[PDB]
Scaffold this active site. Structure first.
Site, PDB file in Angstrom:
ATOM      1  N   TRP A 157     -11.260  -7.900   2.930  1.00  0.00           N
ATOM      2  CA  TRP A 157     -11.826  -8.166   1.605  1.00  0.00           C
ATOM      3  C   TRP A 157     -11.869  -9.688   1.365  1.00  0.00           C
ATOM      4  O   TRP A 157     -12.564 -10.163   0.459  1.00  0.00           O
ATOM      5  CB  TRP A 157     -10.961  -7.549   0.503  1.00  0.00           C
ATOM      6  CG  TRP A 157     -11.021  -6.060   0.375  1.00  0.00           C
ATOM      7  CD1 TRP A 157     -11.959  -5.337  -0.307  1.00  0.00           C
ATOM      8  CD2 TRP A 157     -10.085  -5.102   0.902  1.00  0.00           C
ATOM      9  NE1 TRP A 157     -11.667  -3.997  -0.241  1.00  0.00           N
ATOM     10  CE2 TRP A 157     -10.520  -3.823   0.493  1.00  0.00           C
ATOM     11  CE3 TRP A 157      -8.906  -5.213   1.675  1.00  0.00           C
ATOM     12  CZ2 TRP A 157      -9.827  -2.636   0.827  1.00  0.00           C
ATOM     13  CZ3 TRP A 157      -8.203  -4.022   2.007  1.00  0.00           C
ATOM     14  CH2 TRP A 157      -8.675  -2.756   1.578  1.00  0.00           C
ATOM     15  N   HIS A 188       0.877   4.169  -2.769  1.00  0.00           N
ATOM     16  CA  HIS A 188       0.519   5.552  -2.403  1.00  0.00           C
ATOM     17  C   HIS A 188       1.602   6.598  -2.694  1.00  0.00           C
ATOM     18  O   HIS A 188       1.290   7.783  -2.819  1.00  0.00           O
ATOM     19  CB  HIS A 188       0.107   5.645  -0.933  1.00  0.00           C
ATOM     20  CG  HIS A 188      -1.367   5.529  -0.704  1.00  0.00           C
ATOM     21  ND1 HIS A 188      -2.251   5.123  -1.680  1.00  0.00           N
ATOM     22  CD2 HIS A 188      -2.116   5.726   0.412  1.00  0.00           C
ATOM     23  CE1 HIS A 188      -3.472   5.070  -1.181  1.00  0.00           C
ATOM     24  NE2 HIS A 188      -3.412   5.429   0.090  1.00  0.00           N
ATOM     25  N   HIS A 226      -6.060  -5.927  -3.117  1.00  0.00           N
ATOM     26  CA  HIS A 226      -6.998  -5.796  -2.014  1.00  0.00           C
ATOM     27  C   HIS A 226      -7.331  -7.141  -1.364  1.00  0.00           C
ATOM     28  O   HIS A 226      -8.017  -7.212  -0.354  1.00  0.00           O
ATOM     29  CB  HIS A 226      -8.253  -5.080  -2.439  1.00  0.00           C
ATOM     30  CG  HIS A 226      -8.156  -3.589  -2.313  1.00  0.00           C
ATOM     31  ND1 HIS A 226      -9.159  -2.750  -2.747  1.00  0.00           N
ATOM     32  CD2 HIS A 226      -7.204  -2.792  -1.782  1.00  0.00           C
ATOM     33  CE1 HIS A 226      -8.822  -1.499  -2.489  1.00  0.00           C
ATOM     34  NE2 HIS A 226      -7.646  -1.493  -1.902  1.00  0.00           N
ATOM     35  N   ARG A 238       0.853  -1.188   0.000  1.00  0.00           N
ATOM     36  CA  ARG A 238       0.000   0.000   0.000  1.00  0.00           C
ATOM     37  C   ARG A 238       0.903   1.258   0.000  1.00  0.00           C
ATOM     38  O   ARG A 238       0.528   2.283  -0.576  1.00  0.00           O
ATOM     39  CB  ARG A 238      -0.908   0.013   1.244  1.00  0.00           C
ATOM     40  CG  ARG A 238      -1.965   1.104   1.219  1.00  0.00           C
ATOM     41  CD  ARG A 238      -2.552   1.375   2.578  1.00  0.00           C
ATOM     42  NE  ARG A 238      -3.082   2.734   2.625  1.00  0.00           N
ATOM     43  CZ  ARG A 238      -3.307   3.433   3.733  1.00  0.00           C
ATOM     44  NH1 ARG A 238      -3.086   2.923   4.937  1.00  0.00           N
ATOM     45  NH2 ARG A 238      -3.773   4.666   3.632  1.00  0.00           N
TER      46      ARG A 238
END
Ligand code: ZNH
Ligand code: ZNH
Lengths: 108, 294
Positions: free
Chosen positions: B191, B52, B175, B48
């Protein structure tokens, strides 16, 4: 034995965080992503009725004892090639002992 | 005047083996501190992070991107959509002291590459050469995507990163790792069930589970399943849109196709906005810990 024996309460948090998404351990418990693990010790691999296993888990046919189970939770895909148990593995021996001692209790 | 040209400059006298030792440092520490976030580990927060810091790219004027290593600065570090990635930066700093020669961009992007391979995912080619840039090149907040949106939004947002329909569906499959934290984003729950093993479950869960739109404890609207899983409004938009739905079914049936598609898309994401010279080395494919006998 070769495997020692640790804490059953530390092994409860290990199951709850790392196994309970897919497994239940109580009597008559439902099959989720993975099968019910009640009575897993002293039973052969791929024998829980009502659940659809891969051909690899049934063909392996090993009687689940505390030792070969510690070998399985280390690296599932190396022990039973072709298994659909999407799992990383318990790399630390202390965590293996702690969980096997809790599983011994929780599953008869 | 044309956009800024970010030329990849390899760190003085370093080659494959020097970067393999940095990969190996991130991988063993990932294995050591496996207690993090109710035993999920640091694996998901690192991918992540890599996204980002790369996700701030803007193809029109080449601002943002992984190159600058600008996440170490307070404006990007304190970006509301970057909430939770402090833990990822904190994991990475002790190994930055052990390897002071490596640029920040190279380290954040490497952590992502390391995290996916170690979590049994596909082997993703990685290139070095990112160089630290000053405080003034730091992207202003608001370039990252929102979760409470539709398919039209997702398609228009990813156009800025030069990503097509196939690339976004593949990238969204990451995810399958970790969860949403209410303290960080305003959404709660996983998820999937295999939160630290890289698989195609995201897609199988998307169309095989029964989803109901509910309200969480932050008043935000998210799609829940009876099995305890969740989907963001942008995630479920992937089965609402006919074009996205076809690719989702393709990835749910073929994991190897997802794996090969994620890798090219992720490598492209991490490399966006960087110009690699002709003399620059060909991409590095690192050896996992399991491949070294660990
Ligand atoms: C947690 C640390 C877990 C275990 C303890 C554990 C054990 C376990 C055993 C002993 C089997 C074999 C069952 C048999 O009767 O032969 C098995 C099988 C399968 N599992 Zn698991 N397992 C732990 C955790 C997890 C997690 C996190 C998942 C969920 C993604 C998972 C899934 C499954 C699964 C789908 C199994 C069937 C394997 C097959 O090839 O048929 N396990 N487990
Ligand atoms: C549209 C679009 C989008 C969106 C909106 C999102 C969103 C999001 C959110 C909200 C979250 C949560 C946070 C917290 O912590 O709470 C996340 C997570 C996330 N994410 Zn993601 N994403 C996305 C894309 C993405 C991509 C592309 C990738 C890569 C490749 C990712 C990867 C991620 C991860 C892995 C995670 C997990 C983390 C943890 O768990 O730590 N992601 N994400």
């Amino acid at each position: 034995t070769e495997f020692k024996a640790g804490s059953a309460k530390k092994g409860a948090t290990l199951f709850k965080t790392r196994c309970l998404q897919c497994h239940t351990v109580e009597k008559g418990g439902p099959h989720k992503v993975g099968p019910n693990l009640h009575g897993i010790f002293g039973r052969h691999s791929g024998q829980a009725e009502g659940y659809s296993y891969t051909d690899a888990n049934i063909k392996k046919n090993v009687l689940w004892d505390e030792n070969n189970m510690s070998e399985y939770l280390t690296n599932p895909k190396k022990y039973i090639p072709g298994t659909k148990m999407a799992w990383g593995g318990l790399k630390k021996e202390k965590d293996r002992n702690d969980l096997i001692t809790y599983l011994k209790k929780a599953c008869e | 005047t044309t956009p800024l040209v970010h030329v990849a400059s390899v760190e003085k006298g370093r080659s494959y083996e020097d970067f393999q030792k940095v990969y190996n440092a991130i991988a063993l520490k990932l294995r050591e501190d496996d207690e993090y976030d109710n035993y999920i580990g640091y694996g998901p927060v690192l991918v992540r992070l890599a996204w980002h810091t790369s996700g701030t790219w803007d193809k029109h004027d080449n601002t943002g991107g992984s190159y600058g290593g600008t996440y170490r600065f307070k404006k990007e570090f304190n970006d509301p959509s970057n909430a939770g990635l402090q833990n990822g930066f904190k994991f990475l700093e002790p190994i930055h002291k052990e390897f002071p020669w490596i640029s920040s961009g190279d380290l954040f992007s490497l952590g992502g590459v390391t995290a996916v391979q170690e979590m049994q995912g596909p082997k993703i080619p990685w290139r070095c050469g990112r160089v630290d840039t000053p405080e003034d090149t730091t992207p202003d907040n608001g370039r990252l995507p929102d979760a409470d949106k539709d398919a039209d939004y997702v398609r228009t947002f990813f156009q800025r990163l030069n990503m097509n329909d196939r690339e976004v569906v593949a990238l969204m499959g990451a995810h399958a790792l970790g969860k949403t934290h209410l303290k960080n984003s305003g959404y709660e729950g996983p998820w999937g069930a295999a939160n630290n093993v890289f698989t195609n479950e995201f897609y199988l869960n998307l169309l095989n589970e029964d989803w109901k739109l509910e309200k969480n404890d932050a008043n935000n609207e998210q799609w829940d399943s009876k099995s305890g899983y969740m989907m963001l409004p942008t995630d479920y938009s992937l089965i609402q849109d006919p074009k996205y739905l076809s690719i989702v079914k393709e990835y749910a049936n073929d994991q190897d196709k997802f794996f090969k598609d994620f890798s090219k898309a992720f490598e492209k994401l991490l490399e966006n906005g960087i110009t690699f010279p002709k003399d620059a080395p060909s991409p590095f494919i690192f050896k996992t810990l399991e491949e070294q006998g660990l």
